[PDB]
Design a protein around this nucleic acid. Sequence first.
DNA 1: ATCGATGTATATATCTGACACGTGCCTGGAGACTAGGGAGTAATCCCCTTGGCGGTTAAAACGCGGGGGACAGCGCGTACGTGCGTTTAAGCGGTGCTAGAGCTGTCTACGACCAATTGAGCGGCCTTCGGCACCGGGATTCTGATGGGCGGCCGCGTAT
DNA 2: ATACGCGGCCGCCCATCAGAATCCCGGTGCCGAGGCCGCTCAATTGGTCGTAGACAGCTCTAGCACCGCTTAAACGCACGTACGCGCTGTCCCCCGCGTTTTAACCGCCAAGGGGATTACTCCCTAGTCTCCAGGCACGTGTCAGATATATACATCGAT
Lengths: 103, 105, 93, 95, 110, 97, 92, 83, 76, 76
Amino acid sequence: TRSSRAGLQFPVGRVHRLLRKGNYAERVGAGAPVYLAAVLEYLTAEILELAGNAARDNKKTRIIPRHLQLAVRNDEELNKLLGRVTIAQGGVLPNIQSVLLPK
Amino acid sequence: AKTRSSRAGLQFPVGRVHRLLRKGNYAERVGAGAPVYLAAVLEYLTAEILELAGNAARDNKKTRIIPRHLQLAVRNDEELNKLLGRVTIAQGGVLPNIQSVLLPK
Amino acid sequence: TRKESYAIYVYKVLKQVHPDTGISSKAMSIMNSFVNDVFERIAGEASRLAHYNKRSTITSREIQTAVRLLLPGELAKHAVSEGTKAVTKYTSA
Amino acid sequence: KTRKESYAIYVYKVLKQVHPDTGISSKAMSIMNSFVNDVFERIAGEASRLAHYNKRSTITSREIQTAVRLLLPGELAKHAVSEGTKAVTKYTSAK
Amino acid sequence: AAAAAAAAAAAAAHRYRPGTVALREIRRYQKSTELLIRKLPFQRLVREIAQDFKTDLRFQSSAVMALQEASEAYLVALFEDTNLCAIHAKRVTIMPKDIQLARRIRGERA
Amino acid sequence: PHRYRPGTVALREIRRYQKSTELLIRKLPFQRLVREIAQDFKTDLRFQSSAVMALQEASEAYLVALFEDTNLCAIHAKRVTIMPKDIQLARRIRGER
Amino acid sequence: GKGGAKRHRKVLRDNIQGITKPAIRRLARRGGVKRISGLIYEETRGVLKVFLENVIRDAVTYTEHAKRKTVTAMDVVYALKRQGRTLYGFGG
Amino acid sequence: KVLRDNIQGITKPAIRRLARRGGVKRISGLIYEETRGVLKVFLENVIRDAVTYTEHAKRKTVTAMDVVYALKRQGRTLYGFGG
Amino acid sequence: MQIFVKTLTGKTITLEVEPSDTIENVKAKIQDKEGIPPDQQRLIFAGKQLEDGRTLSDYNIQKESTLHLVLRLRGG
Amino acid sequence: MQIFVKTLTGKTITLEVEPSDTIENVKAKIQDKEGIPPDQQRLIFAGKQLEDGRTLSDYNIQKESTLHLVLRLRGG
DNA sequence: ATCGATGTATATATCTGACACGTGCCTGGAGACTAGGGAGTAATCCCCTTGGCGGTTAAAACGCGGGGGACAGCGCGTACGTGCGTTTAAGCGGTGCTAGAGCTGTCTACGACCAATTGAGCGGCCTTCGGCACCGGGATTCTGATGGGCGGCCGCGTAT
DNA sequence: ATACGCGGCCGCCCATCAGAATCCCGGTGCCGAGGCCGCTCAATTGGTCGTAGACAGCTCTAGCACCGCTTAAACGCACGTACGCGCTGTCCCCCGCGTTTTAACCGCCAAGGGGATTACTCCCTAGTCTCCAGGCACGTGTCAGATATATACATCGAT
């Protein structure tokens, strides 16, 4: 049943409904609900873990907002995908500009 | 009057715009005076833009109107180019504008 | 087979306002493009709002605000006015 | 009562999959659903756009397939397709 | 023959004093994630202008919280470039214009 | 014998060139270049002559805009000639990349 | 030169005098510049004002297209979305 | 024949004229090369977006029409040639 | 030069104008006297509607002509 | 120092790596002697499957450590 | 200080090919009818936002002074624009071909529609073991008043 | 009158008993996965008619490619003046810091406005029918603007 037959972690019989109720095209291609659940799970997983790494970087048991952006902001790729989407209680990377050195 | 446009006193196509609102999937039910309202609106805008476009054409010694005439017409007015700021122009061309300081003593 | 244009609607109004004047063939095309874009941003606007509070209708007011927001002031307000008058014009008739 | 549904069940197992006895705040949880729902419209809307350009009237998987390709940069994109193509491929195998 | 030692830093350690805090506060501010601007003056600032565009206004607790977040974040970002501009100039000083260029080229500023 | 004082010619054209609409890039080389990359995804594909122009306009204007941002920053420094960094500086701030 | 039943009440929460100047510098260093001009920070609030209006402009509009007295935070989001400064964390 | 020695086609003068259009007054030697790189960046991404639809359409002769939609995607809408 | 405008009531107002003055300038003057906005004014003389962006001289309107002010005929 | 891995075969293999050096970097050197991909190899220490970009100090590795090895499944 | 040479505007008529027209046919527009569920309005309740209030308690808020960064002066260097001459290659409109776009016509796969049954999902509620940092009992080590015996007090004191 | 005795004091090493202090064994407080649960309302199951849409067919457009005379644009090459830019040096505008005064923040206690659901009917639209003229293709020519060629002045810089 959906997750089973498809073999994914995401809800295949949930995004099908919204795509038909959003009202995208006339009817809906059979391709999509299933495919559309798949990439979504894939992205879901790509962040959680780097967020995990980031929390472990500075040694923490639980991940929190601060971690998430630290993870993404540092990453080259994700960072561009969410280039201008701006973020809850996030703060920022340590950055020291060059000629502002304490010589 | 038979023609709808005329019942609302206009040049813009009442019913052609109605169908375009149904072939665009935008929603399950199409409104009745929406169509008109909308037609009429653009009508103004066109005019608004097309009113100076001509004036620009007058400006430069021509009786016709080439596209730059649309371009200058849109850039100068702040309430015109402001909206279209995300519009770039078939051979738009440029406002003569030379920055303050590189001009010579 | 049936290439559409909004050239016909521009064609009258042009003359209505500057009768000793004309359009470039590409300048008209540019205008054709412009209206449709312009038709879509609004329509798009309209649709989102309908959906937001689950509205199975684009009424005559849903468009009105939509424009109000979409447009810079001086232009927006005149257009708001033309709009109601037209409804005024059409319903009794 | 009220509804206000979210993707909380899906995000949670994913994180379990990648550090099982690792934790999360109730503030980063919404960021996550906010993030998903955001990507949802981004992809499905674009699909809608192409469908009624080159003149057809339903949205299948292929389109997403195409859509995805230009919505994202080189390296992630290929792996993403791959994953995507197989998941479904298996889905059909069963039936 | 007893010799109490100056081993502990006190207020003579940490190198000298020239440009000593300058970079210090920066770091502590970064590790933290608290609002830079107060959350009481800001609250009225909005209520007050919001009246001028409409009457009989109400506000969700968060709605402002949210604006604060937006705004703060909005400025920092601004400054962040400003800084660069500032550097470009042979300067470590954000200037009244440094602000303008930044905005002008982003495009809200003319 | 006569040669124009430096900076007397360049401005004159700026404007001449500002008034007009006509494209600055070459029809042949442009085209070849477009073909070069397109092949690199998939090889040997065709485009209507206009389709090429459609593409040609969108970028010709695009530069001229960036050069304008590059110039302000050159000015901001008390300078006179658009240097490299300014372009990059500009690129970084727009945060396109 | 009289007591004259004098009563003093002036306004410093909302109004820009009232707000705290360090509140800004607090902001300035996160960026990490070494120096703050007096002139500059005054301008900066100036712009804040410009940014702040447009949003509320829209906010107000969405509150009002629905005939609602209570302004939603979502309402702010869409506003931000329109200018391309959308906020994750909120109001899916 | 794979097209190459292309990048240069956009010779010294043409890059320069753009800049005057820009309202720059003068120009160092170095950046003729820098811009070509970007120009390329920009073309690549757009053509990348464009080509897919064309493939999507079971065709080769990629249309002007795609050039444009593809431009609308990156966020450089064009008024002039389309639909 | 002066022109005249016969308002809705039949009352005539005097405007000081040049023949190169635009219809909107005259409508702005009528707004300044009567409080009617330019967009709600139609200025009529003898079976021509005078249009925005055009001049008094575009319609050969000269000295001590009387224009007729009307509002917007609504189908009702 | 010395780092120890226990394989599925059971046979014990002894190799010497700097503690500062990252685990991923050390795996590469051990994947050139056996001719086996680091990807394929899965290692667990003290109930935790080994994590990429985790330093040996953050893993509290000790000399003569005992790490369980798991072979990998991809069906296709 | 008068002059020249260049660049730009402006004058001329004129020929041509695109913008405008008229015509005429057909698909897209208007009108007429119904049905049903979209969307308003009209009714109740209780949550949410606003307010006022005291009180510390750290921050806001100042200043003064001088250090350190900004800006004005100076001076050398050299690199780019403006122009010339030679050479190199696009652009120009012409032909000729067939490949691939566009049309066109029947089949059929796959989605929407109507039906009924059950379990995936959310809030609300509820759970115990494992880790951060404070903490508990017992043997053992270092400080304090005790105490006779060997020496020294020189100064009061009894015996002949 | 004249010389002997001593008396508690006192520095000495040398003996006794409890207090302080570290290791041997520690409990507590705070967060985050499991698990239970239960009515239920949203997906799934088993399934026909028809219509988009793929596909098989076709021809006749348009995308390439070539060829050659002309020529506008690109190159390479050489000079110098007026720009970058680093050096230098002071005066004063910020930092840092010492104290004085303001207002942020938390906690408490109030009241009703407004937001969300529910219940009902009637206004408004798509969807469906019939008929027709607006709007396009079809055809065709001119007139708005573009070029070439004569005509005088500006104007920045050299002398």
